[PDB]
Design a protein around this nucleic acid. Structure first.
Ligand SMILES: [Mg+2]
Ligand SMILES: [Mg+2]
Ligand SMILES: [Mg+2]
Ligand SMILES: [Mg+2]
Ligand SMILES: [Mg+2]
Ligand SMILES: [Mg+2]
Ligand SMILES: [Mg+2]
Ligand SMILES: [Mg+2]
Ligand SMILES: [Mg+2]
Ligand SMILES: [Mg+2]
Ligand SMILES: [Mg+2]
Ligand SMILES: [Mg+2]
Ligand SMILES: [Mg+2]
Ligand SMILES: [Mg+2]
Ligand SMILES: [Mg+2]
Ligand SMILES: [Mg+2]
Ligand SMILES: [Mg+2]
Ligand SMILES: [Mg+2]
Ligand SMILES: [Mg+2]
Ligand SMILES: [Mg+2]
Ligand SMILES: [Mg+2]
Ligand SMILES: [Mg+2]
Ligand SMILES: [Mg+2]
Ligand SMILES: [Mg+2]
Ligand SMILES: [Mg+2]
Ligand SMILES: [Mg+2]
Ligand SMILES: [Mg+2]
Ligand SMILES: [Mg+2]
Ligand SMILES: [Mg+2]
Ligand SMILES: [Zn+2]
Lengths: 111, 47, 71
RNA sequence: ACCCACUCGGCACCUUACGAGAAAUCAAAGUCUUUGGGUUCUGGGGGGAGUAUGGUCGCAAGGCUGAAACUUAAAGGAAUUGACGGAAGGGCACCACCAGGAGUGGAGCCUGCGGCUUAAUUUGACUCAACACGGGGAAACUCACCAGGUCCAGACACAAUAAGGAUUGACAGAUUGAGAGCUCUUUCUUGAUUUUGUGGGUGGUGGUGCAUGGCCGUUCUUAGUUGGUGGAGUGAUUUGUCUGCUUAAUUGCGAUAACGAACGAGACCUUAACCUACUAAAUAGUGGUGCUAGCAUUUGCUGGUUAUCCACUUCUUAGAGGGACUAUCGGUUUCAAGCCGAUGGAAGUUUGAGGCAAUAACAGGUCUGUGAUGCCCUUAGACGUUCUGGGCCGCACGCGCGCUACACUGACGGAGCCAGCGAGUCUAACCUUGGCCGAGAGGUCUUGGUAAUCUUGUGAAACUCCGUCGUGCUGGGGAUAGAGCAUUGUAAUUAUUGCUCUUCAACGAGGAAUUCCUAGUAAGCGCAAGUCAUCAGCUUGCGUUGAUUACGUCCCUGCCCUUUGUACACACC
């Protein structure tokens, strides 16, 4: 369970995502039911960016003991967006100023 | 570690697939070809 | 739940009986054949089918049901 | 007697810690693996047990000395984080109160739950988080229940039977609720499709939501969660993440061994508001001109004419923009974040209302939404499935959501007469204008619409106006019930619904209790959509009319937060 999921999370990452999340629910080999989160990198969970960036899927894997849920979450890099906003609304970036060499008593040029 | 190694072989299969390497006669019309006769017999209705 | 009340008296399905039959085609002698049990006139029945005999009855079995022919 | 400095020996506290310790802490518990100043005493895993036995002291109670067999993998210490408390301190909220509003609780009925009744009255759910909930408004269907009747749609494998017939079907009669060849009489038919048996499947609104997935409800009308570098600790960990202040908010300010960051909040997105600025429109609408009707006549006033033409985009529509940032000024405050008032503004309560929403928990609910699913049960006299009929509506009564009222700010009768969110028919009968007939419900002939084009300006209702009635259960109220007419449907009986006449009950403001709510809100009022053949007293949205009273607190109730205690960690079930 850990190997399988952990691999998936790492391959997604190696494919250049911003973040990824895997959840397995239901029973493995023990009578009682548990659930596990597997997550790496960056994700946002709320607002319109959700509809934009993260991609979700659930699959029911049917086994001899019972059935497990598989939930997957992939957060795409908004910098590569190519159709849409290229950043989260959160992103506020200040262009960097440039060192000046002031004074220089005025004169003038001619053309 | 074996998760990683898994992901590394998934990159092997993925990067290797970036390059890597008729029975005629048409049964629809074969019944129309075999449509030739002498396939049955019909006679009846006495009294 | 409840499990099994009933007033006895179960019900059997059917047999189809035995009837090695078709022993009724009558020969007089050597070799003439007089053909007992007269045959149906319906075009779906090619006269290879006959009519059963009950009281007031001549009935075509090949027609699952249809066409009482009375004599 | 008192003050100041010193000094012996006291009882203690403070700060440090070089040093010590498992830590809590300790001027000794320090000067110990760099292990030796002198000396006394006790312990050697937990129970068994301070028990048995002997001795000895005692008046006695009992004291001192004091074993074993057997049993057992822990018991125990200090500290960390949780979880919990019928401990302390702070907060937050109309699912709390305050100031009040409209009520419910009383009545008649409607509807759900219990109970009883029943052949059956199918079933899930029971504090907020069960009870107008399962979109659950059930005549058949639905349908799971009860009285009965058919069918296999029992894959596939092996075997048996068997082409001298493995098997299928049926006219009439009997039979049956039945024009079910269900079964039987009789006797044609069918041709290897089936039958019989075992193995193995299959279906099931059968069980298990305490075996699961998924989804949802709750804590949460909440504000919490984490990692980078640095500080503390041997360590789990901790500081960051905090007394205060501020905020709807771990929202910020500020203090500060922390500095700077991410998730969640905010941002964001949708809807309602502002554009005489932009782009336009016979499926939106205005002015003008024709064409045209009426009244005045002095030019005028009020209409008709899905194209007779010309022009426009204010109103309508939806694309692109713009706009607000709590702006400006001033009060108050650590003059910080902020908060309050005034002016301006379409808009200044997160601009109003939503959508989305981290970590974590619950044995919350759903196997009766799923051809989602483990296991169990059943599987041909079926718990499969279909067909007929009944039942879920059954009525001494208990509980809950509601409808309609007790009238004169009213009923009734005329008359005025204004919305918005919606939906609507192809291999079909959906939304319906118009004309006739009919008191009505409705009927009938036609018609426009696959829709900004037609229904529809949805001429909705409260409401406004003029009258009738006069405080009398009255003409308030419309329960119950009789008789008749229509509509949906194969079917209306236990009365689906609608219409007419008649019958005219309780109820004179509702005990103890208890719900909801702060502005276009509360309350009054109808409408569209869901469901739907027919049936809304339900819900989801919509617009119309439009208040009173707070603008506060912690008294009650609910929940959060620290502090604190813990022998709990499956965590007070
Ligand atoms: Mg965010
Ligand atoms: Mg948000
Ligand atoms: Mg120390
Ligand atoms: Mg009050
Ligand atoms: Mg009251
Ligand atoms: Mg039935
Ligand atoms: Mg049948
Ligand atoms: Mg079998
Ligand atoms: Mg079997
Ligand atoms: Mg099922
Ligand atoms: Mg559960
Ligand atoms: Mg569940
Ligand atoms: Mg149960
Ligand atoms: Mg509130
Ligand atoms: Mg803290
Ligand atoms: Mg305009
Ligand atoms: Mg003003
Ligand atoms: Mg339970
Ligand atoms: Mg389910
Ligand atoms: Mg019911
Ligand atoms: Mg309710
Ligand atoms: Mg009346
Ligand atoms: Mg009136
Ligand atoms: Mg008439
Ligand atoms: Mg009266
Ligand atoms: Mg009152
Ligand atoms: Mg309706
Ligand atoms: Mg309902
Ligand atoms: Mg503690
Ligand atoms: Zn025949």
């Amino acid at each position: 369970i850990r190997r399988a999921a952990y691999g998936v999370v790492r391959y997604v990452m190696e494919s250049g995502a911003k973040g990824c999340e895997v959840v397995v629910s239901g029973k493995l080999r023990a009578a009682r039911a548990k659930a596990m989160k597997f997550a790496d990198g960056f994700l946002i969970h709320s607002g319109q960016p959700v509809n934009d960036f993260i991609d979700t899927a659930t699959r029911h894997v049917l086994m001899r003991q019972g059935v497990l849920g598989i939930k997957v979450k992939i957060m795409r890099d908004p910098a590569k967006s190519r159709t849409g906003p290229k950043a989260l609304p959160d992103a506020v970036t200040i262009i960097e100023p440039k060192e000046e060499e002031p004074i220089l008593a005025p004169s003038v040029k001619d053309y | 570690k074996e998760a990683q190694a898994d992901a590394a072989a998934e990159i092997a299969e993925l990067a290797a697939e970036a390059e890597d390497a008729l029975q005629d006669y048409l049964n629809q019309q074969a019944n129309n070809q075999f449509n030739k006769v002498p396939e049955a017999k019909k006679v009846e209705l006495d009294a | 739940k409840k499990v099994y009340t009933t007033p006895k008296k179960i019900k059997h399905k059917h047999k189809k009986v035995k009837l090695a039959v078709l022993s009724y085609y009558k020969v007089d002698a050597e070799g003439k054949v007089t053909k007992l049990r007269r045959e149906c006139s319906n075009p779906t029945c090619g006269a290879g089918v006959f009519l059963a005999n009950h009281k007031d009855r001549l009935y075509c079995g090949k027609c699952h049901s249809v066409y009482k022919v009375n004599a």
